[PDB]
Design a protein around this ligand. Structure first.
Ligand code: IHP
Ligand code: MG
Ligand code: MG
Ligand code: MG
Lengths: 222, 81, 290, 56
RNA sequence: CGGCCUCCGAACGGUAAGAGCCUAGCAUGUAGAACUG
RNA sequence: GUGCUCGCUUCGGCAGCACAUAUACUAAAAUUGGAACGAUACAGAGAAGAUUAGCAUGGCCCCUGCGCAAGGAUGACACGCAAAUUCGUGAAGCGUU
């Protein structure tokens, strides 16, 4: 219900969140729609976390409806935990996860090797899920603060608005030359055109800066 | 030190009163020039998002008097140099 | 934002009991005019009376000096238009959005330079209290300010909640009465206020002493003196108001004539005495003699 | 102290709200939304209390 | 009697920008309502 | 309402004392009003000859994004620009003749 309220509060009626937590477009989107309807890694991470908990809850709902078994419930939970990689799709929004994915694969190999030793064969029924379960509980120990902060940000942008007054953006790698000139010509203005004035009316600063620009082109061309 | 300590912790993060209406007008009240009231603080819901849209975007101190000097004007000699 | 102590509003809007129940909610809402977020107080004015709430920016309320919940003035309880026009006030209340934000901000800075006793700005320097406004004030409390709304349910018959209905189970005023359309902005700015306009047609029906024709008729006829009126006492009454040119107290009429040497004295005196002259408790009537 | 309620209280509340499309609720709408920020905590608390295959 | 075994995917970056009109949505649940010899 | 009075005092009431103390945006409502990037329909792309990569400044302009990153046609818009000023107008004072 929370993810739907968010979608429809954003008015994206052309999108649909189904009950296994996949977000799907319902038609083809024009450009303005494709743009307004992109969601970020906060929304998609909350989705896939909720998708994993649903898979676990419904393994138990089947056992409680009578459909499977205690042994098949255990084996299925152990499947979920060793294969969170291809059941959910969390890694696309946090590729750091593949470290937990590789951990749970390694534990699978260790446990199967020790399990299927003698009479028991290479079939499915091994459920020892304490290991992978541990691993994802530590994953969440960590991600819970991240997502609380990210989702607070997204909701506070939704309910107050987007603040552009005092952004204070950095100078990064693409703004380095433009910034150098912004500052060179701010400094030139300060320095001469109001500490050596008596251009009293206007110190034709916009023309002294044209001389500065032409001096640089002449240097460059020799 | 302690004032800035307050403000740093701030920006990181029923009791009674006596009221004299000043329009008291003994016929206005039941007849008491002083009212006693307990103010209490209403609880906020933890599960609720920022209320009103402060993204909005917009009268300073009196202008300082220019204890300046008088300017003395521009010769034509300098106005050409 | 503002974070304050308590609301200033008419004692009528306060209510009947000497002990009040008021709950504070910090930054609870934005002013209906100022839109500045201000701490709101909620009060239960009486049993089965609708709960009142602080309804305007603290700065917006210190500016115009009205009931910060009832919208009526704090002195007599008169709507902005009527109170101001009777005080001879033509105020430049901001209506622009940007100039309104800037205005309420600067006015909060001025109220910050103010000391919480007198209404800030020009709103005070017109303090010649007008008897028309005084008589236009409701001298007893109008606690009808807290009577509940109508319940559409019982208005169609449907309110099966019993007496637990949060609205008065009374026949709804068919909207056409212009007393129904007083938006907060209208009642605040005092523009297109039709309740106050009916008050103005009233004030035009309220009797004053109409002036006679002849600019030599400076004879003010006093009626209703009794036998306990003294000539010198009525002289002391009309004395500082100008020159009393002659006194003629008709005891066989229980009347009198005060002849004035100044037409201005006679006019201003009669107008100040109209239906308000109280000597020895007598309801004295000023008129212009023939 | 704070005393606990019967389970049908919450079971009924949630069943009623169903999926918040009925217009009756429509203020829950924004509080419901505001509770999103704490949803990764509810998931963590749910999954660490999983029921352990020797129990039904 | 030594052993030695990577990599696995998502977003932006291309299919415009608009002015207008039309019509559900979406916000409020308000304040206050007549006066005489 | 529970209970206790070696209570009136039967098993009824009544009495007395003990304990128990104030919820609530009171509303199932009723109005009230903007928007939906939806059609429609027009409309219809920076720099010099042509085709075109961008990174900025500015400000009551915003959108997607966790974002102090990035993107949105270089996001869009900025498009009169005034001004003093080369010489005179006149106005008014302060001194000289
Ligand atoms: O289905 P996958 O994800 O490919 O995993 C399988 C599988 O494990 P699951 O049972 O969890 O599905 C196998 O184990 P068995 O079930 O067959 O016992 C098997 O491993 P073994 O052959 O060692 O049993 C196999 O390995 P291979 O790649 O050799 O087919 C592989 O496990 P991996 O994760 O190593 O691929
Ligand atoms: Mg591009
Ligand atoms: Mg850009
Ligand atoms: Mg730009």
């Amino acid at each position: 219900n929370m993810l739907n309220l968010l979608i429809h509060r954003k008015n994206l009626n052309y999108l649909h969140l189904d009950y296994n937590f996949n977000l799907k477009p319902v038609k083809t989107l024009t450009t303005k729609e494709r743009k307004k309807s992109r969601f970020g890694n906060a929304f998609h991470l909350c989705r896939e976390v909720l998708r994993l908990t649903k898979l676990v809850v419904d393994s138990h709902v089947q056992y409680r409806l009578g459909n499977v078994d205690a042994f098949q419930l255990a084996d299925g939970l152990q499947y979920i935990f060793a294969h969170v990689g291809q059941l959910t799709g969390m890694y696309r929004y946090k590729y750091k996860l593949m470290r937990q994915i590789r951990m749970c694969k390694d534990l699978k190999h260790l446990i199967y090797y020790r399990f299927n030793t003698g009479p028991v064969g290479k079939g499915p029924g091994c459920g020892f899920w304490a290991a992978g379960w541990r691993v994802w509980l530590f994953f969440m120990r960590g991600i819970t603060p991240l997502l609380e902060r990210w989702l607070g940000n997204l909701l506070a942008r939704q309910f107050e608005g987007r603040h552009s007054k005092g952004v204070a953006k950095t100078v990064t790698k693409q703004r380095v030359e433009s910034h150098f000139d912004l500052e060179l010509r701010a400094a030139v203005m300060h320095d001469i055109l109001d500490m050596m004035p008596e251009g009293i009316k206007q110190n034709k600063a916009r023309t002294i800066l044209q001389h500065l620009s032409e001096a640089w082109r002449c240097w460059k061309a020799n | 030190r302690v004032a800035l300590e307050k403000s740093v912790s701030q920006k990181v993060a029923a009791q009674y009163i006596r009221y004299t209406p000043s329009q008291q007008g003994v016929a206005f009240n039941s007849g008491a020039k002083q009212r006693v009231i307990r103010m209490v603080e209403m609880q906020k819901d933890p599960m609720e998002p920022p209320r009103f849209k402060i993204n909005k975007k917009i009268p300073p101190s009196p202008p300082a008097p220019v204890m300046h000097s008088p300017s003395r004007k521009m010769t034509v000699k300098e106005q050409q140099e | 934002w503002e974070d304050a102590d308590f609301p200033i509003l008419c004692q009528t809007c306060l209510g009947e009991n000497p002990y009040i129940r008021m709950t504070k909610e910090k930054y609870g809402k934005e002013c209906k005019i100022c839109a500045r977020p201000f701490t709101v107080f909620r009060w239960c004015p009486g049993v089965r009376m609708r709960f009142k709430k602080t309804e305007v920016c603290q700065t917006c309320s210190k500016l115009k000096n009205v009931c910060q919940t009832c919208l009526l003035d704090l002195e007599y309880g008169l709507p902005i238009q009527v109170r101001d026009a009777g005080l001879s006030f033509k105020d430049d209340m901001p209506k622009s959005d940007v100039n309104k934000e800037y205005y309420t901000q600067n006015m909060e800075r001025e109220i910050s330079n103010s000391d919480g006793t007198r209404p800030v700005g020009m709103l005070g320097k017109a303090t010649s209290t007008s008897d028309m406004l005084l008589k236009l004030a409701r001298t007893t409390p109008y606690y009808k300010r807290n009577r509940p709304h109508i319940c559409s349910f019982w208005v169609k018959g449907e309110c099966k909640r019993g007496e637990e209905c949060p609205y008065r189970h009374e026949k709804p005023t068919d909207p056409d009465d212009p007393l129904a359309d007083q938006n907060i902005k209208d009642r605040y700015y005092g523009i297109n206020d039709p309740v106050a306009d009916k008050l103005l047609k009233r004030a035009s029906t309220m009797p004053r002493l109409d002036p006679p024709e002849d600019k030599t008729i400076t004879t003010l006829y006093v009626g209703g003196l009794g036998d306990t009126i003294t000539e010198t006492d009525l002289r002391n009454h009309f004395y500082q108001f100008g020159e009393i040119r002659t006194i003629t107290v008709v005891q066989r009429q229980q009347c009198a004539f005060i002849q004035f040497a100044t037409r201005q004295a006679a006019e201003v005196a009669a107008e100040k005495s109209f239906n308000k002259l109280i000597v020895n408790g007598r309801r004295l009537n000023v008129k212009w003699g023939r | 102290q704070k005393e606990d309620m019967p389970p049908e209280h919450v079971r009924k509340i949630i069943r009623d709200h169903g999926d918040m499309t009925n217009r009756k609720f429509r203020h829950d709408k924004r509080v419901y939304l505001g509770a999103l920020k704490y949803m990764p905590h509810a998931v963590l608390k749910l999954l660490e209390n999983m029921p352990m295959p020797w129990e039904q």
